[PDB]
Amino acid sequence: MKLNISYPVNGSQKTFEIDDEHRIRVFFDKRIGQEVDGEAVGDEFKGYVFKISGGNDKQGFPMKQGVLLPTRIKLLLTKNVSCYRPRRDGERKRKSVRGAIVGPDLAVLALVIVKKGEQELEGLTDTTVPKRLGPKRANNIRKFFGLSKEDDVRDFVIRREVTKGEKTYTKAPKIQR
């Protein structure tokens, strides 16, 4: 199967392809959230720890934490939940969903790195990726800089440069509260 690995310290991610039943099999009967020590899966990932988070079987149905089961089942789903985005106020749909227990019926495992191993993984540890948007509400700026209700925000807000060609500009949020 294909592994979907995220390094959420850097905000990085890359996919990996494992053929070899014995290399995979380490993931079997493991549930969502279980940790998995790395070396078993490869020599690259030696030491690395993975917390499983979800992923898809063939036919593409998403896993859903909490089901248990290594099979698929059809559930009534509601507002505020995984694997369902409601079309209408108070709409519920009965939908197929995959169990949270890993089997070889999965096209893709979704892992999140919890501990770094002894060696670097290129697109993941080597590369590092900027947090798209900065604090907008007053006291969140105060916190992301540690400030006191003294320091005055305005000159602490983020300032994003972007060019008109020969006119390079500067846009900041609009503080709230």
Binding site: T128, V129, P130
Partner: protein, 135 residues
């Protein structure tokens, strides 16, 4: 090869053992032997048959090892760039201690104090014009 479990007794079923019933709906049932099979047919309730996993669970028989198993952990690490912020801008920014902040600060804080009262007199300006600005 899989070990199924007896759906009346919770017993381990190894390949070849017992039987598999397929009900009208399509609920599949597996029995490990003809005892569980029979008790199922008599419409017995596993929860009241004492040798079953189900009864044993419902009566807190056993466990003890589970009320003993507790703890374990390990966690964390460090820092990644943000695009328009290399780890270096992030070191440089973070590092600089209060007295440069106050410095920087009270400079700008005086610097545009000038701009404010300047624009203000600018108002009265386009207004002693606009309470004039004749023929």
């Amino acid at each position: 090869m899989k070990v199924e479990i007896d759906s009346f007794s919770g017993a381990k079923i190894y390949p070849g053992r017992g039987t598999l019933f397929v009900r009208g709906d399509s609920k599949i049932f597996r029995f490990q032997n003809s005892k569980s099979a029979s008790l199922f047919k008599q419409r017995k309730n596993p929860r009241r048959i004492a040798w079953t996993v189900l009864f044993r669970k419902h009566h807190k028989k056993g466990i003890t090892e589970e009320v003993a198993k507790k703890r374990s952990r390990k966690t964390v690490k460090a820092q990644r760039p943000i695009t328009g912020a290399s780890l270096d801008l992030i070191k440089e920014r973070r590092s600089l201690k209060p007295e440069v902040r106050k410095a920087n600060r009270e400079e700008k804080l005086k610097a545009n104090k000038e701009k404010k009262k300047a624009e203000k007199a600018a108002r009265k300006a386009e207004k002693a014009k606009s309470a004039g600005t004749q023929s």
